[model samples]
Target: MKTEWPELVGKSVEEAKKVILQDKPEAQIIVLPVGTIVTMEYRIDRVRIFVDKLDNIAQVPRVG
Candidate 1:
């Protein structure tokens, strides 16, 4: 289902979110700062994009 977006790493959060939404139109996106605490639960409709202090995505975004 095209869940992983390695290409999004190091990109702007705004740009990464746009690409993710285009691919997964029904996804619920969450922008998180790096090292932030999150639940272990997985949700198919959720996409978490972790960003660095510079506001650039720090990791690959994927549907969870």
Candidate 2:
């Protein structure tokens, strides 16, 4: 993760979770796809993060 924009390509799951969890503490954090798991990973480049699945990035309660 880059220092200035770690959220874009680096790691911001934890930090993102803090905000999401506040509204949805029961939300699950996992990648979502419409095809086979194997195929999903094969074309990971095509995968996108949904506003409803941001927690899928990792899941965090807080950040320091």
Candidate 3:
């Protein structure tokens, strides 16, 4: 899958996950970077909130 050239936010490690995890109701699962971006002026890079409405997940491994 083509990585989204989506805009990224500058947030702390805890803050980023907090925002992402908050969408558990409409989301299938949270997919976050496994490491921190210390030099990025933040701990997290970006967040992609996706829902499981189709079978496309198996195609790209991280889509629904």
Candidate 4:
């Protein structure tokens, strides 16, 4: 997912999640990188939110 990036910027976290899951429904890590990084901690059932200060998305990660 390099050149064909997802449209995830400037939208709320909820909105972003909807679009992301539409494609990768089995997501695994909705990572909202705030003042720190939790690259070790793990979760399940989602890899598709991750928003910012105003509750809006700031980055669409490079998916594999």
Candidate 5:
């Protein structure tokens, strides 16, 4: 289970998602805008990838 992907920040969401899925095959990816409000609950199967206006990942994607 990969925990974090700091290097993925600023990468395109499409490319980041592919890299994440390769590391954690069971991850349930949730793509959201950088400032979107979301629940605080965490799950081992979840990976949240926040992106900016240009569809580039704004935050480091990680398992939650």
Candidate 6:
């Protein structure tokens, strides 16, 4: 089942949270720092939203 990704990219952090929570209520949201390393652990039902310092989302992945 492919989830929606288009609605997230280029969107605000708040808007991304809405879509994420709708799927994973208690999903963990992480704001990666410069050159942050994101491990490929078992995300399970997580929603990782990559955002910039200005709170603008870069993209949303579907492998959560």
Report backbone clashes per prediction. Answer: 0, 1, 0, 3, 0, 0
**Against the correct fold, how does model 2 do in TM-score?**
0.31
Candidate 4 residue 19 Cα shift, in angstroms, is 0.5
Candidate 3, residue 40: the lDDT equals 26
Residues 1-64 of candidate 4: C-alpha lDDT, one tens digit per residue: 3222357777776666677667666765455655555564444444534567687866664453
Alpha-carbon RMSD, candidate 1: 1.0
lDDT of 2 by residue, 6-49 (tens): 24232355655454445445544434332324423332112233
RMSD of each: 1.0, 11.7, 14.2, 4.1, 1.1, 2.5
Q: What is the TM-score of each candidate against the true structure?
A: 0.90, 0.31, 0.27, 0.58, 0.90, 0.66
**Collision count of model 4:** 3
| Cα lDDT tens digits for candidate 6, 39-64 | 77766566666776777777664545
Which stretches of model 6 miss by more than 4 angstroms?
1-4, 33-35
In model 4, the runs with Cα more than 4 Å from the true position are: 1-5, 29-33, 41-49
**Full-model lDDT for every candidate:** 0.90, 0.34, 0.32, 0.57, 0.89, 0.65
lDDT of 4 at 51: 63
- Backbone steric clashes in candidate 1, count: 0
Candidate 5 Cα deviation (angstroms), residue 40: 2.8
Model 1, residue 20: what's the lDDT? 89
Tens-digit per-residue lDDT, 4-49, candidate 3: 2222233343443344455333433343343324242321334343
Off by over 4 Å in 2: 1-11, 31-64
Candidate 4 residue 44 Cα shift, in angstroms, is 12
